[PDB]
Amino acid sequence: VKLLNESGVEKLVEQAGPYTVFAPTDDAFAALLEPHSFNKLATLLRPENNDALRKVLMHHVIPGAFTSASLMDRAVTVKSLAGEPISIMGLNKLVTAGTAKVVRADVPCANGCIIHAVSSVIIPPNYVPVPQPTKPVFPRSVIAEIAKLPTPRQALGLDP
Amino acid sequence: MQDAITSVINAADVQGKYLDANSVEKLRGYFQTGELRVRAAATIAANAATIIKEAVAKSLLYSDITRPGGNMYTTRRYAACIRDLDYYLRYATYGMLAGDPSILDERVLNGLKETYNSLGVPIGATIQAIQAMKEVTGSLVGSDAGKEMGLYFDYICSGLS
Amino acid sequence: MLDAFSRVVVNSDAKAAYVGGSDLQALKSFIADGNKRLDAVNSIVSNASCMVSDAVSGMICENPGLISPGGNCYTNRRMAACLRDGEIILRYVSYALLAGDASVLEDRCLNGLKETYIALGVPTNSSIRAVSIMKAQAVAFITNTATERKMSFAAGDCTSLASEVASYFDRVGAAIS
Amino acid sequence: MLDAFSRVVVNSDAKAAYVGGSDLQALKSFIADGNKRLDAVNSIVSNASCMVSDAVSGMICENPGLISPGGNCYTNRRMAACLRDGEIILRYVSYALLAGDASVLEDRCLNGLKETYIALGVPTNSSIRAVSIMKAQAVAFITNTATERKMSFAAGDCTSLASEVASYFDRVGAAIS
Amino acid sequence: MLDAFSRVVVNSDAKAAYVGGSDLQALKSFIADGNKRLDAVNSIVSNASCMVSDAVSGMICENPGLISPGGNCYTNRRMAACLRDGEIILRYVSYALLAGDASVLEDRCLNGLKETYIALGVPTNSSIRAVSIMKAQAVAFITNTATERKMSFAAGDCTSLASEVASYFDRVGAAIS
Amino acid sequence: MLDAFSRVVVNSDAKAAYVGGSDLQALKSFIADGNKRLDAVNSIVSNASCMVSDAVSGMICENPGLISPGGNCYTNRRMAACLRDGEIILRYVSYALLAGDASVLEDRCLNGLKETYIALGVPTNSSIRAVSIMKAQAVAFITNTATERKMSFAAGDCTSLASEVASYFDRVGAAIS
Amino acid sequence: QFRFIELNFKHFMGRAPLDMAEMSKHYEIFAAGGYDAEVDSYFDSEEYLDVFGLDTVPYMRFRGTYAPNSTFNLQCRLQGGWARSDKKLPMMSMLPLNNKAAIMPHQIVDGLPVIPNSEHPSQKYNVPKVSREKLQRELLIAQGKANALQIELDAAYTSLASSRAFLAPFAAMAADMDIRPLYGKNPQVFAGQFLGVGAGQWGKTGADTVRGRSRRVAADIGVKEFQLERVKQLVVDLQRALALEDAEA
Amino acid sequence: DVVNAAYPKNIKNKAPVISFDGKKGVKLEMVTLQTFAGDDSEDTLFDYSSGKFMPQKPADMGIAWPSGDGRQAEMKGGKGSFNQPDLRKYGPFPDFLKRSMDL
Ligand SMILES: C=CC1=C(C)[C@@H](Cc2[nH]c(/C=C3N=C(/C=C4\NC(=O)[C@H](C)[C@H]4CC)C(C)=C\3CCC(=O)O)c(CCC(=O)O)c2C)NC1=O
Ligand SMILES: C=CC1=C(C)[C@@H](Cc2[nH]c(/C=C3N=C(/C=C4\NC(=O)[C@H](C)[C@H]4CC)C(C)=C\3CCC(=O)O)c(CCC(=O)O)c2C)NC1=O
Ligand SMILES: C=CC1=C(C)[C@@H](Cc2[nH]c(/C=C3N=C(/C=C4\NC(=O)[C@H](C)[C@H]4CC)C(C)=C\3CCC(=O)O)c(CCC(=O)O)c2C)NC1=O
Ligand SMILES: C=CC1=C(C)[C@@H](Cc2[nH]c(/C=C3N=C(/C=C4\NC(=O)[C@H](C)[C@H]4CC)C(C)=C\3CCC(=O)O)c(CCC(=O)O)c2C)NC1=O
Ligand SMILES: C=CC1=C(C)[C@@H](Cc2[nH]c(/C=C3N=C(/C=C4\NC(=O)[C@H](C)[C@H]4CC)C(C)=C\3CCC(=O)O)c(CCC(=O)O)c2C)NC1=O
Numbered sequence A: 001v002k003l004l005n006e007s008g009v010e011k012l013v014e015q016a017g018p019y020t021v022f023a024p025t026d027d028a029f030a031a032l033l034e035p036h037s038f039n040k041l042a043t044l045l046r047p048e049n050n051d052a053l054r055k056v057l058m059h060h061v062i063p064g065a066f067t068s069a070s071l072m073d074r075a076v077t078v079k080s081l082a083g084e085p086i087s088i089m090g091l092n093k094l095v096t097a098g099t100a101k102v103v104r105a106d107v108p109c110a111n112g113c114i115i116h117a118v119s120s121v122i123i124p125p126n127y128v129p130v131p132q133p134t135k136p137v138f139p140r141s142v143i144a145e146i147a148k149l150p151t152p153r154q155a156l157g158l159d160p
Numbered sequence B: 001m002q003d004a005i006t007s008v009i010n011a012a013d014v015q016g017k018y019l020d021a022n023s024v025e026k027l028r029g030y031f032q033t034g035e036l037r038v039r040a041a042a043t044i045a046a047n048a049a050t051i052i053k054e055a056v057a058k059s060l061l062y063s064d065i066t067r068p069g070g071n072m073y074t075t076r077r078y079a080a081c082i083r084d085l086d087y088y089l090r091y092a093t094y095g096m097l098a099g100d101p102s103i104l105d106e107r108v109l110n111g112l113k114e115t116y117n118s119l120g121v122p123i124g125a126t127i128q129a130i131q132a133m134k135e136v137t138g139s140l141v142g143s144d145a146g147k148e149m150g151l152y153f154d155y156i157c158s159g160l161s
Numbered sequence C, D, E, F: 001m002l003d004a005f006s007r008v009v010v011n012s013d014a015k016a017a018y019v020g021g022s023d024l025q026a027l028k029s030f031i032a033d034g035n036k037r038l039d040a041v042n043s044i045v046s047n048a049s050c051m052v053s054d055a056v057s058g059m060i061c062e063n064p065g066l067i068s069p070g071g072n073c074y075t076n077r078r079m080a081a082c083l084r085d086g087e088i089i090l091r092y093v094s095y096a097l098l099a100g101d102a103s104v105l106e107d108r109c110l111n112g113l114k115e116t117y118i119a120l121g122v123p124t125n126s127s128i129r130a131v132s133i134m135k136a137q138a139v140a141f142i143t144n145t146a147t148e149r150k151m152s153f154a155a156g157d158c159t160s161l162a163s164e165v166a167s168y169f170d171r172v173g174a175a176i177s
Numbered sequence G: 001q002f003r004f005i006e007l008n009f010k011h012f013m014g015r016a017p018l019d020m021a022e023m024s025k026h027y028e029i030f031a032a033g034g035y036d037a038e039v040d041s042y043f044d045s046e047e048y049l050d051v052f053g054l055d056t057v058p059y060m061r062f063r064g065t066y067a068p069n070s071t072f073n074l075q076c077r078l079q080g081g082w083a084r085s086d087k088k089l090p091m092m093s094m095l096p097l098n099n100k101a102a103i104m105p106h107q108i109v110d111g112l113p114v115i116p117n118s119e120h121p122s123q124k125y126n127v128p129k130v131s132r133e134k135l136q137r138e139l140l141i142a143q144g145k146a147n148a149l150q151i152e153l154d155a156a157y158t159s160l161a162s163s164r165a166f167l168a169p170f171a172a173m174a175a176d177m178d179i180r181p182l183y184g185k186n187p188q189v190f191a192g193q194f195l196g197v198g199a200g201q202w203g204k205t206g207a208d209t210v211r212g213r214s215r216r217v218a219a220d221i222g223v224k225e226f227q228l229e230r231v232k233q234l235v236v237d238l239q240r241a242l243a244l245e246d247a248e249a
Numbered sequence H: 001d002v003v004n005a006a007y008p009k010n011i012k013n014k015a016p017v018i019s020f021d022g023k024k025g026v027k028l029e030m031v032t033l034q035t036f037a038g039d040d041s042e043d044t045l046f047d048y049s050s051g052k053f054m055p056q057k058p059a060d061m062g063i064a065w066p067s068g069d070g071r072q073a074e075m076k077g078g079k080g081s082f083n084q085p086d087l088r089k090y091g092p093f094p095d096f097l098k099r100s101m102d103l
């Protein structure tokens, strides 16, 4: 709820459309200290990268009211309000949302919306982590680069 | 729906008191500022359309929430705004005359933030519009009258938040 | 195990109905894109041995505590077993992309794999990374946007088959989490 | 993890770019050393898969009665749970190193932990040894004085970040003693 | 200061080597395109009074708070010292375009410029979007694609001189960032 | 020595005092058992951060109520201030060990400390508990009887300096009592 | 000796060393002929007599153009504050001139002469006497508020760039139309109020009377850059007191 | 309280940091060696608050509405002369719920 309030995504899931939120408990957020997952998600801790934070939180909102009872051995996909598809897979009473492994079944909400508690944070499929802030580097000199470009007489094999 | 005078009767009735002489404190200004509030409500009635045209051009219309996809794109949706901003500038005028913001939450604030979340209206841009509308209202009515009319604008912005 | 044909059988068995004309359009469209699916499995099987070495070593260069002593990729039996279960998982996903339903993925591959990896002491955080690098390769091979090997395919679209194999690897990553 | 700093919102329809009324002043002032802090948490969690196996086996080789039959780490359910509690403690230390305060450590992890271990029969005098190995492990990474693994960094100083993370590890160990 | 030929000497002085035969192949193609370089700085210096008045008064079109009271371009002493500063930046960029090397821009102009502008109260974000209007003006004057003034050149291609003077202008905005 | 040590120690401002070769042998002739004594303070200050982070934490390891909410090693500014005060007494013991007198430790570091710790609400029994740990370490480091480390010294006896460093630590506890 | 070469650029020429090359020349003029050869290097110069002549006492020069930019910051570090003497100060300029130590922006504010009007007048005298630890907490809070105010000013610049691309197919499509008005340009037609503009309607600025999507997000930029510049001038005098919290310590 | 004149403005200067750099001299420095600080106080010295501000909402008065019936959170003066007290109590209420005195 705090990330929603800061990131401005919370206005979106205020709306009356029937949503199926997969809100991760903070043990899931506390479980973001993977050596692996910290690579692709730590860069969002920077205060300018609210841009991807909406795009990663908006992957947890599903248009429609998918209760766990509605997932009796059914595998149906859908895209989020982020814009990319997510596969909800309920088999053997183990309902999955990407890499969710849902903990608590459903929570009935106001506008016919449902809330499922997940064990991890779903990263969108074609999400690349933002690079760290770097140094704008400038070519040191100009004769090391004319010497870096192949002349036309080189391209025809006239020269070495 | 109580004014400054109602409020004192109304508070002072419920403990059946008569007025406890201090009680009139507020009342005794209130009548002192009675001349200021009418002239403040006078010019605001005259420049109602001009104030709302100044606020939206200074705040809100300078970021999407005018372009396609933004919350204010279609002409029905744009026309709902100036209809919607008219109530804030109008009901704030009522609070400025009555000297008590009871009319705002009675007729504006209750079910308001719960309604914008239903429609998906951005509360952030709404308050900015009222803040800009508060800024132009201090232009017309002056400093202290703007302090009075401005005192009910942020009351709307606070509860609407 | 089931497939894309027998999934709508046992769904139509639950309503005790016959497989009528409103459900054959889910299947006749599936067979009409049957040549696209067979061209989609063949991008995986033709790079199946180099994808598992691409992915387990990418788990090592992000999480270097596995090759430290006391880790879980330390010895040669432990490294070769981690090259085994990168491709055994890839063996069942390539069955489940071929069959069109994830029943083989959820009764043979994931048949208590979370109970295995706890009892083996395998770190489950690193095996999410080894599965998901194979997810990021398979959506580049099916869409033919791998940066260093292009295969010659007839033009069209495979965003459905790329998003189907992206839901099979997340299925694996949901259950061993 | 993502609550440990403050991200600014700039677009419309947010509610927090306009009406939010606060920039977080105590967290806008923690990115003022924040490049030094994010490298320090990157030292731990890129070695945490090696840190938990070194520390748990450190108290086995210093006290061999825990893998004795009748000891508290003999069964495979108990050996997996002892490896799980070391990683979960190491993550919540890495929360509190990242967030800069030990409130999240003493709320989710340390609250009701001494009452847990004396109800389960977990030995507390051996469990504080396993934390204090990880106290000695984490100061070697942040000062980059570890023996068999170095990491590249920018040039500078990282004392009072190793000294900050030594202040969380005894805070774990005194809450369970 | 250095030029393009003093730059290749101090690289060769670092290894105590003679400027041989293979690295004279690139120096002879610098001097062969030296007539386009003089034909390019002549299209900047000829237009240089209107370049810093299209830029400073285009900075005001994106920020009316500069010409509000208290503002940075508010009074006549302050607008005159900003039109002075906008053509110092255009003077040292044209020196480095003429010299072939940006060493005269980095120590005589851009060194210490950021904390100069903090101390006087100059908004550094308005300077970055002022020198980026001059960046787009210069690359329209090199490539002869300005809409209101065309100059008469010989036929050919000066795109490498356009992105050399573009890199001298985003070297300014990296210093006052 | 003292002259230029005191000169930038209590005798004046913040210099340092670099001591050279020909000034060294005059100091070693002046200081009795100087080749043992310059190994004695080298066995302390090369292990300075290891000795503090025991001794602050070992106070919490015996008194766990200080990091309770309401204790004084709660609220991380106060926990870091206890670790700076533990580092100051460890340093100022070693200058008294270097100069051979407790005079400079008393006036600069120790006078008024008893009124200071009762003005801040510092529990003054635990500070004697903290410096008794540092009393126990410095007799072990000087005699090379340390547990996990041993130092390569010239062979001999240093029990007379180890009793001399015992006579500095209890003067702290006699003052803050 | 290092302090003696520092003041000779200040006391006689009225500036700083321009770079380390000019300062290392004057150690060779001292190596040749000593004190009176090094002192006569300034008064027998063409830069002396073109500025001061034979009649004016030397002074600290605030010219405009500064052929190194780093020599402006160094002359405000050297001659800073009206009541400040040069007695028992340390040496200040070797590490700025070799790009080792950057000059802090509060040490340039002490050197500059005081203007009447600032946008943000300084709290140099209005900081309360609190401890060293509460000054460190109030500095790191104000540095954090300035970092979040920067990255919502950058989001305002991306909205200005998106507002111009929204209207650029029509901004250039109306640039080759024939838009002829009815009045306002030639004086033979009755224009009424619009001979110029009429009676107070020009505004406080002139740009506030212009309507448009890109003018309306520009006024959002000017109110967002005011709050960043207010808190960037608040970390200067929080730091400067830090210099006197430490320099006197 | 600052009783610390006995600890003057040369407070945490830390004289005995000693670095031997081999077999040579001891090279005593004077480095202050600050902590992992943070200096935790509220309401610092300046505002640090640009615009963005409309956070104030009044307190919840229960089920009535905020600030409407404060006539029980009320205020004093005479209670009149012929008021006589009550027999049953039915102790004190959350402000007679919605309608005010002037309904
Ligand atoms: C998204 C993830 C993310 C990170 C991992 C860090 C990575 C990171 N660290 C630093 C920059 C730095 N990092 C360190 C830290 C260290 N150096 C040492 O020698 C110590 C061993 C170690 C501390 C544990 C130091 C000392 C600097 C220099 C800047 C400073 O001191 O503030 C910089 C700035 C580079 C520069 O400008 O020079 C970056 C991007 N920041 C991020 O945003
Ligand atoms: C039904 C589906 C199916 C699988 C998925 C695999 C997975 C699998 N791997 C191992 C066995 C192992 N598996 C691993 C694997 C790993 N450890 C790591 O650090 C990495 C995260 C990961 C590789 C990517 C290792 C290191 C062992 C060795 C344990 C041992 O030798 O006892 C075992 C126990 C077998 C045995 O040792 O007898 C199984 C069942 N095999 C299967 O039959
Ligand atoms: C630090 C260690 C490190 C590595 C070893 C590589 C490993 C690696 N490669 C890819 C990403 C990929 N990896 C492969 C794998 C291969 N390419 C082929 O053609 C063969 C089949 C196979 C090598 C034999 C493919 C096809 C992609 C997709 C992009 C592409 O190569 O076109 C990814 C996922 C994207 C990412 O997170 O970067 C990773 C981790 N990257 C690293 O960061
Ligand atoms: C025995 C083994 C066996 C196979 C390997 C496949 C071989 C195969 N692939 C396609 C045919 C195709 N394959 C693709 C697929 C793709 N094209 C792209 O540009 C994408 C990169 C990729 C998506 C995954 C498309 C788009 C067609 C043509 C349209 C279609 O068949 O539906 C066809 C039909 C056209 C033809 O005659 O070639 C056949 C036989 N079928 C088999 O029976
Ligand atoms: C959020 C914080 C958090 C924790 C700190 C742990 C704390 C914790 N540990 C255990 C449970 C356990 N914890 C241990 C661990 C140990 N016993 C030993 O002898 C060693 C000293 C030590 C490993 C280093 C063991 C062996 C069990 C199982 C006890 C049993 O089943 O008999 C349990 C009971 C439920 C379970 O089985 O997991 C809990 C809540 N879990 C949490 O959720």
Ligand SMILES: C=CC1=C(C)[C@@H](Cc2[nH]c(/C=C3N=C(/C=C4\NC(=O)[C@H](C)[C@H]4CC)C(C)=C\3CCC(=O)O)c(CCC(=O)O)c2C)NC1=O
Binding pocket: C068, C069, C070, D047, D050, D051, D054, D055, D057, D058, D059, D061, D062, D133, D136, D137, D140, D141, D145, D146, D147, D148, D149, F148
């Ligand atoms: C009898 C059994 C026995 C063990 C199993 C080991 C385990 C072990 N290692 C360390 C001590 C340490 N352990 C590590 C950990 C590591 N070093 C690395 O290079 C890897 C990344 C990582 C292991 C995977 C580090 C960095 C130290 C600090 C000392 C050092 O620099 O090596 C300690 C604490 C010792 C101390 O504090 O003095 C222990 C018990 N030692 C033992 O005596």
Ligand SMILES: C=CC1=C(C)[C@@H](Cc2[nH]c(/C=C3N=C(/C=C4\NC(=O)[C@H](C)[C@H]4CC)C(C)=C\3CCC(=O)O)c(CCC(=O)O)c2C)NC1=O
Binding pocket: E047, E049, E050, E051, E054, E057, E058, E061, E132, E133, E136, E137, E140, E141, E145, E146, E147, E148, E149
């Ligand atoms: C009213 C508000 C107002 C504005 C918004 C700006 C308009 C403006 N003009 C230019 C851009 C320019 N300005 C010039 C300058 C000139 N053209 C000539 O032919 C003359 C020789 C010379 C004036 C003396 C040139 C050459 C360009 C580049 C565009 C082009 O013509 O190709 C840019 C740069 C785009 C960027 O940010 O990258 C902007 C914003 N000026 C204003 O006044």
Ligand SMILES: C=CC1=C(C)[C@@H](Cc2[nH]c(/C=C3N=C(/C=C4\NC(=O)[C@H](C)[C@H]4CC)C(C)=C\3CCC(=O)O)c(CCC(=O)O)c2C)NC1=O
Binding pocket: E056, E066, E072, E073, E077, E078, E079, E081, E082, E083, E085, E086, E088, E089, E108, E109, E113, E116, E120, E122, E123, E124, E126, E127, E130, G062, G063, G064, G065, G066, G067, G068, G069, G072
């Ligand atoms: C070597 C290279 C070199 C430079 C780059 C300039 C840098 C520079 N600019 C100014 C001085 C100034 N610079 C500005 C500039 C601006 N305010 C704005 O609205 C814009 C964002 C911006 C440029 C258009 C103003 C307004 C002053 C005067 C301050 C005032 O009196 O209000 C000064 C102080 C000059 C003095 O007063 O003596 C210096 C050193 N000078 C140099 O010698």
Ligand SMILES: C=CC1=C(C)[C@@H](Cc2[nH]c(/C=C3N=C(/C=C4\NC(=O)[C@H](C)[C@H]4CC)C(C)=C\3CCC(=O)O)c(CCC(=O)O)c2C)NC1=O
Binding pocket: E032, E033, E035, E036, E038, E039, E040, E042, E142, E143, E144, E153, E154, E155, E156, E157, E158, E161
């Ligand atoms: C004293 C002042 C002085 C000058 C202004 C230049 C004048 C100048 N420009 C060119 C000649 C030229 N100038 C250009 C440059 C351009 N043509 C374009 O189409 C682009 C718009 C622009 C790129 C910047 C080209 C392409 C040639 C001809 C080829 C060449 O000289 O390499 C030449 C002929 C050289 C030759 O052909 O051998 C001369 C003398 N030289 C001077 O001595």
Ligand SMILES: C=CC1=C(C)[C@@H](Cc2[nH]c(/C=C3N=C(/C=C4\NC(=O)[C@H](C)[C@H]4CC)C(C)=C\3CCC(=O)O)c(CCC(=O)O)c2C)NC1=O
Binding pocket: F056, F066, F072, F073, F077, F078, F079, F081, F082, F083, F085, F086, F088, F108, F109, F113, F116, F120, F122, F123, F124, F126, F127, F130, H002, H004, H007, H011, H012, H013, H014
């Ligand atoms: C050169 C000589 C020298 C010293 C001897 C110390 C003495 C000292 N300690 C503290 C200050 C302090 N000292 C402690 C220390 C402790 N409290 C405990 O619970 C533990 C028992 C013990 C640490 C082991 C704490 C907690 C504070 C901060 C008090 C507070 O901020 O609430 C202060 C600051 C007081 C102030 O600012 O007014 C001083 C001067 N510092 C010096 O510069």
Ligand SMILES: C=CC1=C(C)[C@@H](Cc2[nH]c(/C=C3N=C(/C=C4\NC(=O)[C@H](C)[C@H]4CC)C(C)=C\3CCC(=O)O)c(CCC(=O)O)c2C)NC1=O
Binding pocket: D132, D170, F047, F048, F049, F050, F051, F053, F054, F055, F057, F058, F061, F132, F133, F136, F137, F138, F139, F140, F141, F145, F146, F147, F148, F149
């Ligand atoms: C820099 C490396 C370095 C170390 C780590 C320590 C290691 C160390 N600790 C102690 C000695 C001690 N060390 C500790 C510290 C602790 N004990 C506990 O109860 C906890 C496990 C831990 C706090 C977390 C304590 C409490 C003593 C005993 C002090 C006493 O006599 O009461 C001794 C003295 C033994 C002797 O002199 O023979 C030594 C060498 N010393 C060093 O030079």
Ligand SMILES: C=CC1=C(C)[C@@H](Cc2[nH]c(/C=C3N=C(/C=C4\NC(=O)[C@H](C)[C@H]4CC)C(C)=C\3CCC(=O)O)c(CCC(=O)O)c2C)NC1=O
Binding pocket: F028, F033, F034, F035, F036, F037, F038, F039, F040, F042, F043, F142, F143, F144, F153, F154, F155, F156, F157, F158, H020, H022, H023, H024, H025
């Ligand atoms: C330049 C800096 C400098 C130092 C750091 C010390 C170090 C030092 N000490 C001794 C020499 C010695 N050092 C010791 C000290 C000790 N031996 C023990 O058995 C104890 C454990 C320990 C006491 C703490 C003794 C006993 C001698 C021999 C007697 C003496 O020379 O005083 C020697 C001469 C060894 C040789 O001849 O090769 C040196 C270099 N002296 C210096 O001049």
Ligand SMILES: CCC1=C(C)/C(=C/C2=NC(=C\c3[nH]c(/C=C4\NC(=O)[C@H](C)[C@H]4CC)c(C)c3CCC(=O)O)/C(CCC(=O)O)=C2C)NC1=O
Binding pocket: B057, B061, B066, B067, B073, B074, B075, B078, G210, G211, G212, G213
């Ligand atoms: C899809 C339906 C739709 C419409 C029509 C629409 C109109 C619209 N017209 C606007 C402005 C404007 N529109 C005009 C238009 C005109 N001036 C003239 O002389 C002509 C008579 C006329 C055009 C033919 C002008 C001058 C402004 C700017 C007014 C100002 O800056 O105050 C604005 C505010 C700025 C902006 O966000 O673009 C909106 C939202 N929005 C919509 O969603």
